[PDB]
């Protein structure tokens, strides 16, 4: 099974977790279960407390102006632990009688694990401590709530505009990470206009809300074509564009997947359904002007094993 554990300074507390990534199934969320191991005598006149909270970091400066704490909490849970599942019951037998299981549930309408590269974004954090209710007597863990590609392909994207006629339609909606996008553009160019270039770009829209709705216009991949269309001539061509985290570096605020500890993660997956960050992807085609937006969903496929906690090649 290879359960994952993290200890605390001075060897006082230790928590065992079956997995660190929880999948949202659009109808239920994987329970955050586990077992905490405590020193045999460290709890005299004290009670162990395990807390799971959601942190939405939204700023980092050198001074709070009046009261702005630069960190808002969306969900707070607390467990004391002084029916068991099939995972934590096995941990009790392996550890002994000094282990106390803790059970946590993630309510619906909660943001996924998203991180903004410069760790700003939504993060899930677990604190385990004992007190009669410091960072050297508590266990700090970070977990990710992620969603994968659904089983419904969805309707075929299509969007048309006229001002010159432009038609674009992607083959499908569900695109895997790293999968190139095949888009077909058809133009008529009725009269009295001549397009100098063909521009196809992919931009990432992130819906961040804490007090008001905000939108992001962060292009990911941009493609430029030198083809020119003369009046009363039809032109059909299929372009290939694919988002990738190679030329998008050094772009502050880019939406990325949840980072555990200074790891490398790809672009944030599209959020499918609240206070948090909602990520959406669109494809923009411009003629040089008329603009056509083709929304699409970019999600990971359903895996057969727990994803790694870091990049497989280290250093």
């Amino acid at each position, epitope marked *: 099974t290879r359960v994952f554990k993290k200890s605390s300074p001075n060897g006082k507390l230790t928590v065992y977790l079956g997995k660190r990534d929880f999948v949202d199934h659009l109808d239920k969320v994987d329970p955050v279960d586990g077992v905490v191991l405590v020193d045999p005598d460290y709890l005299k006149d004290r009670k162990v407390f395990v807390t799971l909270t959601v942190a939405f970091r939204y700023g980092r400066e050198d001074l709070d102006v009046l009261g702005l704490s630069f960190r808002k909490d969306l969900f707070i849970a607390t467990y004391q632990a002084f029916p068991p599942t099939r995972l934590q019951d096995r941990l009790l037998r392996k550890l002994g009688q000094h282990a106390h299981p803790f059970f946590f549930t993630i309510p619906q309408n909660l943001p996924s694990s998203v991180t903004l590269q410069p760790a700003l974004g939504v993060d899930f954090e677990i604190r385990a401590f004992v007190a009669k209710s410091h960072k050297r007597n508590s266990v700090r863990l970070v977990i990710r709530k992620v969603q994968f590609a659904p089983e419904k392909p969805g309707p075929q994207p299509s969007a048309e505009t006229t001002r010159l006629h432009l038609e674009a339609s992607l083959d499908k909606e569900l695109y895997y990470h*790293g999968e190139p996008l095949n888009v077909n553009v058809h133009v008529t160019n009725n009269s009295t206009k001549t397009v100098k270039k063909i521009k196809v770009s992919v931009r990432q829209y992130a819906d961040i809300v804490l007090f008001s709705t905000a939108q992001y216009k962060v292009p990911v991949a941009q493609l430029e074509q030198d083809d020119q269309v003369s009046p009363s001539s039809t032109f059909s061509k299929v372009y290939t564009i694919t988002p*990738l*985290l*190679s030329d998008n570096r050094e772009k502050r605020g880019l939406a990325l997947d949840g980072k555990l500890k200074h790891e490398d993660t790809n672009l944030a997956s599209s959020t499918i359904v609240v206070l948090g960050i909602l990520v959406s992807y669109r494809v923009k085609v411009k003629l040089v002007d008329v603009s056509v937006e083709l929304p699409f969903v970019l999600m*990971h496929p359903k895996p057969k*094993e727990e994803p790694p906690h870091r990049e*497989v*090649p280290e250093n």
Partner: single-chain antibody
Amino acid sequence: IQMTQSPSSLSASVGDRVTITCRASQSVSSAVAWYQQKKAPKLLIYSASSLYSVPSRFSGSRSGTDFTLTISSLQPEDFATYYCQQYKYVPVTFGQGTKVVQLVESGGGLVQPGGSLRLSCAASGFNVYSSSIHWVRQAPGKGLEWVASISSYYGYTYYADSVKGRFTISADTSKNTAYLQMNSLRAEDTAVYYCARSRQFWYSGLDYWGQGTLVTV
């Protein structure tokens, strides 16, 4: 990470049970890929617990720093060499042999030390943005040796400690072709190069291997 295997060259009948043991040296996690090479090597077990989409006879078990491969039913089409690999750090190390969608590459011939000898790898059935390309070396009478790797999604260029500087990996990212620029070739680099493919995000192991090109100095 130095990796040695206790068996060296065993013999068994049709109905015997061949057991292969793999031992690490730095307490590697549950990330071990087993390859069978008669031809290009074929991946059998990845993550030491999962079965590649090969028969069910092959089984993998983890006992800490020691990894064991159990056949439990031998077949006449099993005479090959098995290697043990750990995909936890960039300098991936292959084990020692235990005798008991296609990729096409071009290039070869006499080296005549001093030159380029530009090799190329052709991909048909997959892209480069979602799959990494790995190059390995196999000297005659010796195990596999990873020398280079490319990740087009992240732009990372990984080279071996004894191969960096004299080698250069590149990706076209348009025609789905990968190339390896080699310079200052020495007499110790005479080995067969195998173009390898692996899924970029979930590096489960080198799934499909190339036909291999002979490079002699």
